[PDB]
Every structure is written in C-alpha cells, then in structure tokens.
Design a protein around this ligand. Structure first.
Ligand SMILES: Cc1cccc(Oc2cc(S(=O)(=O)N3CCC[C@H](n4cc(C)c(=O)[nH]c4=O)C3)ccc2C(=O)O)c1
Ligand SMILES: Cc1cccc(Oc2cc(S(=O)(=O)N3CCC[C@H](n4cc(C)c(=O)[nH]c4=O)C3)ccc2C(=O)O)c1
Lengths: 197, 195
C-alpha cells in the first residue's frame, strides 16, 4: 500500500495533474483518488459549516479542517490502505500548514500539533508538491479568471517553501511552471519510481 | 472582570450551584451564566453534528468540542469580559481533559494540546471543582447500568489526575455536603477571589 498526497497553491494545475496521473496509474495499480471531505457524512456537515462561516476565527477554521481530515482518514483512507491500495489524496496536512499555519498566521508549529492529534501518526509516504512560481501561478489565476488575494497567494507559496525546507525527505517537488503534459509526466514518473522501490 | 469555570461529574450539584451562586453574585457584580455552545451559531451547528447522528470517532468528537469551545470563547466569553462582566461558565477545558482525555482514553496530554490550540492562552481566572464521591454522585443522578457507573467513576478518576497537577486556578469544593453548604463554600471561594 502507499499513501500519496498532492499539494500546491491555486494556479499549480493540481486538480488537472492528479486526475491525469490517476487515470494513468489505474492501468497498473489498485488505486483510488480522493479529497477531503470526500463524501463522509460528518466531514460533509463540517464542510457546510466552513463554507457558511461569516468571518470565522482562523483557529476554529483550522480545527474544522482537522476534524474533516480525521473523518476522511478513518472512514476512507485507512480502510483502503488496509486493502493494500495506493491512495492518492488531493490536499492533506500540508495544506493546513501552508494556509492556516503560514498564510493565515496561526503558526506552522501550532497547526502541526493540531494536525498530529487528527492524523495520529498517519503521515503520507510521499507528498508531491506542484512547485509553481508566484508569477506563473498569478497568470494561471488571470487567464482562467486584487492586491490582498495576490499577497495571500504569495504567502501560501512562501509557506509551502518553509514546509518543504524543514521536511525535504517526505516531499518530491515537481516543476509546475512547465506545460501541463510535462507536469503530468514528471509527477507520474516520480510516483512510479517510489511505487516500484 | 473574571472568567470562572465550573467542573465536576454528573451528580456534583453543578447546575444548582451555578444558578444559586449567580443569584447571589448579581447583587454586586454584572454577571452572566453560560455554557458551550451557548447560542453562538457555528457552535450550535457543531452541537447538531455531535447530537444528530454518527458512531463518531473519539478524536473527531474531541475536535468538535474544542471548535465549539473556541467559538463560544471568541464570540461570547471574550466580549463579556471586555464589558467587565463576571462570566460563570459551566464546563470548559477540564471537562475535555476528564471526559475525552481520561474516561474515553485518548490521553490527557493529547487532549490538553488540542485544547491549548483552541483556547490560545485563555485559561480561567478561577475554576471551581465540585468534588463529589462516586457514591454520592450516583444518588444525586437518580434524584444507571454497570457501563454508566464505571464511566462516571472514570470521569471522577480523570478529574483527580487533573486536580493532582494542582496549584492556583483550581479550588476544590466538598460536593458530598448538602447543597446549601456546597453553594455557601462556592460563593465564599468566589468572593475571596473577586475581592
Ligand atoms: C472541511 C473542508 C475540507 C476541504 C474543503 C472544504 O471546503 C472548501 C474550501 C475551499 S477554500 O477556498 O477555503 N480553500 C481552497 C484552497 C485550499 C484550502 N484548504 C484546504 C485544506 C484541505 C486545508 O486543510 N486548509 C485549507 O485552507 C481551502 C474551497 C472549496 C471547498 C469545497 O470543498 O468546496 C471544507
Ligand atoms: C459541541 C457541544 C458542546 C457541549 C455539549 C454538546 O452536546 C451535548 C453533549 C452531551 S454528552 O453526553 O456528550 N456530555 C455530557 C457531560 C459532559 C460532556 N462533555 C462536555 C464538554 C464541554 C466537553 O468538552 N467534553 C465532554 O465530554 C458532554 C450531553 C448533552 C449535550 C447537549 O448540549 O445537549 C455539544
């Protein structure tokens, strides 16, 4: 079994990359792709609270992402891993670290402690980081489309770089500035290398 | 202003005590009584999840109590304290430590770390622990089965562990006494602190 997560800011081509990689991997592996809340009832109810939030306190928001994360992990991820599957998960702990911890300013360490309570030692075996420059990301969120939104996007990227610097061994950075066909190929090759070894 | 929490197992007389102490304190202080979620919209929505169906994982439950706790603190407790109020809060961090941490078996240290994330340094100025024996508590509950009795005993064992890592904020009141005495001791403990 293997638990692989995908991370990156908006404009990194993430959703498109995970979908294409998943379509290629199913040919050779027993794999599922999911994301939180991923249809788990309590997680879906938590998502409604988050989306209905009127200027929600950032720590309450971080706890709701963590509670949805645990429900999705216990009811969906863990049973698939026990069946020997490869699980591809679109966003996991590192999204809370980059967004809630770094960009929103709670602190990466504090958000990590909250998430360790939620995941109870179940870190990913491998995390693909779709490394898009702030400039390319900005353009992918202009062509397919504010100073405070641009500043937030830059802060999310800065947060992912701090996370990757501190836990390099768990991450594989993929150049997401390339055309999407190349990003897909590099991501697929990185995953097969890990799965075959 | 003062943030005062009340803790204890079921059958400790906690409801009677808070209400009676509120009626005495209102003569001299601008006092409010509250409990989580306490009417805060997001907290009320979290409470509906906890109550309205699931076999729910104990850690998800602990995180929902902590999220409701933060919403109640930020939208209800902190604004009342800024108005100079004495806030009497029925259950706070120590209930998660005794119930989720100890009795449900997640671990008190794990639950404390989760709750410190939720309260971000806002510990009570004073916490009244209504120290009832399991036997007296069980008699007040009837005024249940083996599983329920053992869980109640485990909650009390949990509070003893928390109160063992004692000092300053915690004030233990003998809740085995008749309720008029528990109320008097609680009121006198609170006035001593406030004055
Ligand atoms: C309970 C729950 C879990 C996941 C999503 C969700 O709801 C949404 C939030 C947004 S978003 O714009 O808030 N944002 C998009 C960028 C990534 C963000 N993110 C993600 C994770 C997993 C995290 O841990 N922290 C964090 O900030 C969320 C956008 C869309 C949705 C939706 O599912 O429709 C609610
Ligand atoms: C979101 C939220 C917060 C508070 C209550 C709530 O909903 C209830 C849960 C129960 S209970 O039987 O689960 N239980 C009763 C004994 C004390 C228990 N307790 C309390 C706290 C504050 C804690 O941190 N941990 C913990 O275990 C809860 C009983 C009644 C209700 C209701 O309000 O109707 C939901």
């Amino acid at each position: 079994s293997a638990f692989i997560t995908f991370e990156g800011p908006e404009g990194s081509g993430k959703t498109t990359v995970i979908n294409e990689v998943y379509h290629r991997l199913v040919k050779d592996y027993d794999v599922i792709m999911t994301r939180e809340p991923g249809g788990v009832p309590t997680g879906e109810e938590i998502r409604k609270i988050v989306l209905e939030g009127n200027d929600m306190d950032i720590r309450t928001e971080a706890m709701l992402f963590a509670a949805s994360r645990r429900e999705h992990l216990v009811l969906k991820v863990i049973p698939a891993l026990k069946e020997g599957k490869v699980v591809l998960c679109d966003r996991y702990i590192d999204s809370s670290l980059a967004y809630q911890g770094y960009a929103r300013g709670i602190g990466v360490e504090e958000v990590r402690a909250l998430n360790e309570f939620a995941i109870n030692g179940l870190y990913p075996d491998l995390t693909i980081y779709l490394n898009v420059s702030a400039e390319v990301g900005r353009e992918r969120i202009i062509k397919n489309s504010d100073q405070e939104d641009l500043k937030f996007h830059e802060k999310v990227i800065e947060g992912y770089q701090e996370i990757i610097h501190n836990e390099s061994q768990r991450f594989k950075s993929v150049n997401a500035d390339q055309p999407l066909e190349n990003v897909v190929e590099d991501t697929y090759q990185t995953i097969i290398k890990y799965l075959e070894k």
